[PDB]
Write a protein that binds this DNA or RNA. Structure first.
Ligand SMILES: [Mg+2]
Ligand SMILES: [Mg+2]
Ligand SMILES: [Mg+2]
Ligand SMILES: [Mg+2]
Ligand SMILES: [Mg+2]
Ligand SMILES: [Mg+2]
Lengths: 99, 208, 99, 83
RNA sequence: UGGAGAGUUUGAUCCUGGCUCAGGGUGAACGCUGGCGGCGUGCCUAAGACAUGCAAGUCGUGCGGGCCGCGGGAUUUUACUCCGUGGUCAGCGGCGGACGGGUGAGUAACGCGUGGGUGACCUACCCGGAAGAGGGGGACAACCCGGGGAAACUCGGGCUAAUCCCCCAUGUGGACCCGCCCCUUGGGGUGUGUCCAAAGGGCUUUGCCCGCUUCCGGAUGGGCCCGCGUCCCAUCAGCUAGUUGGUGGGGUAAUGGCCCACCAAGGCGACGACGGGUAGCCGGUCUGAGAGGAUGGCCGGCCACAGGGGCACUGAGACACGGGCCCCACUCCUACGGGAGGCAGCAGUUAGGAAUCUUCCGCAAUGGGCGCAAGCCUGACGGAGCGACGCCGCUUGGAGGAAGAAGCCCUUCGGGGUGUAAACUCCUGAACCCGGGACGAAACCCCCGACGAGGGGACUGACGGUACCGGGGUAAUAGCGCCGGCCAACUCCGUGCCAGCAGCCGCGGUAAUACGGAGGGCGCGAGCGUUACCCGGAUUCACUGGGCGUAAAGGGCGUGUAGGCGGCCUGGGGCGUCCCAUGUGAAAGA
């Protein structure tokens, strides 16, 4: 089956395309603890219809670009600027991590 | 190939008469009668409290030296018995006891395991008709361990088959004396042999 | 030190030659067709395009261009001709297109 | 072309073949698509030949030429025998 | 069915903590030693360089020739020419040369592994099905004649056949534009319009066979995409202009910045981007009680590479180890202009190296390629040869034989040891000689039948005159390590912090079980030791399974960012988690 992932839109600063952050949690191979891990996927959006903070399903597809390989299947819920914000700080945090 | 050298000589050293020389090691000397002690310049010298290693060693030497088999061959047999289903020490005595070169001797076709080996190499013995010349052969139960028809004539086969005219034979074996052939009925139980050797020290010898 | 199936090199050169040739004419023909169509042309435009068509299929018979590499070229050409044609007037000499 | 044919197992002076289907281009003792029997040319066992014949028919049915000796043995257990 | 610990810091103790040993293992090498056979396995280094021979062909049932022969014909004249046949050579045309074989350089990546997608695709030969093969035309080698080159070869001119090439037709069908219908990414179906087929050969010759063309399918092989998994350094922290996305093109079997034009300003990174080091990955192998650690030789799977670096052509497939082109390095031929070449195929030579084999027999078996077949080719393979390199089997005798020979060692001078060990008595008979002697091989093929099914028949063994059987028949090899403790085994001489030993603690300064020799003893035995490397013991990186007042170890203190963690009750969801079915988990291995 074509994999369906669900995440959040964290960028629509691109034409016909959205960055969709997707989290995932599991047992750790050796140390037990359930850990989280996450991944942005560039998902195709032909009708620039989805936007910032939409939670959306995502589907395996015939390649649209170098690194577009998923399509926005449906909207799950709107809003979620918390998750977006949560992301966006982690990004701006990296600014005072340098030398 | 196998030991070869002075023998009723650990009818000494291991402290107990091993039956190795057959008819003499029965009759005022497995030298154990004349000299019940270790060989060499220090033989009758004040004994030394020996190590739980020295103890365990000796015991496995003893067992191995009885049947005349080598450490390489012995050690494998044992290994085979640990991985085998059932209490391990007995099993090993079992497999040890199922060797042609020894069943032949248990049936009295020869007087010595050393002598009984030579009969197997040299052809004079069969397993259900067919001739078999490997002393290491695993006699299973139901086999018939015969003399060679062409070898019945021999002075030594006759003299030895003769002294068995009266004699009794092991509970797991039988023996038609005048047809010069016998039978491995089953594999013996620890109880069936009276071996001068505590087997659990052998297991323990090989656990380090 | 003399392997007589260097015969395969001789042959290849011949097919290369035969192949190159049919190809060259499919272009200089297709080019010529789309051109006349960016100019509003009944007969003359499709007539050529329909020569061009044939030639393609012809080349598909052999090892030249085989398959649907074929089809592709037919599609691209006979899309284009038609587009350009309504991008001005005339629709006529039926020729190749299902009007 | 796909084949029914003999793969050498066993050991030296102990040939033992496995009657296998495989792509013709694979090496002889390489990866086969399906075991369908075995064969001991010295007949040192009462059961020196054996063939899953419903399966043999299957492949034959989808086009698979047997070696010539693959087909001899196939015959012995009447793969081709009718009615 | 599974888990042992010991020595060593002190005058003594407890604890911490490192070192060290006992076990298994190896593609090993090295020393002393060395009898027989079976099955395995043998360049780990320079992906350095290679002489010579073999390692990829085959088809005359696709076609026309050259050269050396034989036979028959036209004429009754021997010039000239028609037909048939055998050699032998290449050519044109087809199929194979993309498989089989080698190697691990590169590669930290969709390369591998695993599970999935392909409505985004291709697949020669094989199998099933539907429908075809009617006309015409052309050329280039061979061959012949020129010219250039020293050689490799090369340029021109003329003739010709075909399953070589083109045109036209027939359109079962299939391709594409457009429209409509179903389905839902480019999948089916459908209507007009356009476009596209073919090859002949053999006969046991009107009836078969080997082929040809178009289509749908099957089978087998593969391409591309995705999720998750895949070493070390943060003393590498910021990286990115085809860069991220768009529209439209090209390109491909096919998706996609794969490539291109134009627009937008984007993408990635502490969940470690970028950079540096190292490495082919897996099935599995070894070790371990297990968790885990280490490893990827041989055998099997996937990858990559074919002196180094680019590129494409042909083709179902290649960007091709024994095909092509250019650049670089290197070797050889050279008439100095130019050429030729590529063992990481099998053998074998050299070089580096502690170290790694025969320039062997056979296509008899299995497998592969072409052929209708007979057959031809196959260093794939099946065997033999050399290495105790590994595993297993077996020999160097068996039973008698003294209160006990000799010699050699001890000695409190009585004796004790080697020791039933030899001597010698009977017995058996490894080696060796004679006789016989395999399985592995029944197909293809031919004959009956019908080219089927089934029946019958013949040919064929490299290993090999080997294995195995029978007959005869000789007492016929033993070495290496160790004996202070750990660790099994002690005495005499020699030697005097010397000579030397030593894994660790430590032995030697005139009485040394520790050095060297003796006798004797212990352990293994065609082996035994040594060095290296791996897991172990090491709960000494501690998930299982550790710690931090004084032993190594709490940040100098706050504030708080991300992150980790989160009270009592109820309800919804069912991501975590649990259960049942089912698919996958190749074979080999265990
Ligand atoms: Mg001290
Ligand atoms: Mg790197
Ligand atoms: Mg020493
Ligand atoms: Mg550990
Ligand atoms: Mg403090
Ligand atoms: Mg705080």
């Amino acid at each position: 089956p074509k994999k369906v992932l669900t995440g959040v839109v964290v960028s629509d600063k691109m034409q016909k395309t959205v960055t969709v952050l997707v989290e995932r949690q599991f047992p750790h191979p050796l140390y037990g603890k359930v850990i989280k891990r996450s991944k942005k996927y560039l998902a195709h959006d032909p009708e620039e219809k989805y936007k910032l903070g939409d939670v959306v399903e995502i589907i395996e597809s015939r390649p649209i670009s170098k690194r577009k390989r998923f399509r926005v299947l449906r909207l799950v819920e709107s809003g979620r600027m918390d998750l977006v914000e949560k992301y966006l700080i982690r990004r701006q945090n990296y600014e005072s991590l340098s030398k | 190939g196998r030991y070869i050298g002075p023998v009723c000589r650990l009818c000494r050293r291991e402290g107990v008469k091993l039956y190795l020389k057959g008819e003499r090691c029965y009759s005022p000397k497995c030298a154990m009668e004349r000299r019940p002690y270790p060989p060499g310049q220090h033989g009758q010298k004040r004994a030394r409290r020996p190590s739980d290693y020295a103890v365990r060693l000796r015991e496995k030497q003893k067992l191995r030296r009885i049947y005349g088999i080598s450490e390489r061959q012995f050690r494998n047999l044992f290994e085979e018995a640990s991985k085998k289903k059932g209490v391990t020490g007995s099993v090993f005595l079992g497999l040890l006891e199922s060797r042609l070169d020894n069943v032949v001797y248990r049936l009295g076709f020869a007087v010595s395991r050393r002598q009984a080996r030579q009969l197997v190499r040299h052809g004079h013995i069969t397993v259900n008709g067919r001739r078999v010349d490997l002393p290491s052969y695993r006699v299973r139960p139901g086999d018939e361990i015969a003399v060679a028809e062409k070898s019945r004539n021999l002075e030594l086969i006759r003299q030895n088959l003769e002294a068995m005219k009266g004699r009794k034979v092991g509970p797991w074996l039988s023996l038609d004396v005048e047809g010069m052939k016998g039978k491995f009925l089953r594999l013996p139980d620890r109880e069936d042999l009276a071996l001068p050797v505590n087997e659990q020290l052998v297991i323990e010898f090989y656990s380090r | 030190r003399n392997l007589s199936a260097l015969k395969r090199h001789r042959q290849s050169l011949k097919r290369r030659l035969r192949n190159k040739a049919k190809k060259s004419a499919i272009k200089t023909l297709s080019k010529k067709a789309i051109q006349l169509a960016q100019e509003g042309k009944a007969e003359e435009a499709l007539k050529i395009m329909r020569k061009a068509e044939s030639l393609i299929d012809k080349a598909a018979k052999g090892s030249t261009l085989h398959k649907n590499a074929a089809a592709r070229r037919k599609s691209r050409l006979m899309r284009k001709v038609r587009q350009l044609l309504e991008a001005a007037g005339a629709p006529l000499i039926g020729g190749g297109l299902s009007a | 072309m796909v084949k029914i044919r003999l793969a050498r197992f066993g050991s030296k002076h102990n040939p033992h073949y496995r009657i296998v289907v495989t792509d013709a281009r694979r090496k002889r003792d390489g990866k086969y698509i399906e075991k369908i029997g075995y064969y001991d040319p010295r007949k040192t066992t009462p059961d020196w030949l054996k063939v899953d014949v419903e399966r043999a028919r299957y492949w034959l049915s989808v086009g698979a030429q047997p070696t010539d000796t693959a087909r001899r043995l196939l015959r012995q257990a009447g793969v081709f025998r009718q009615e």
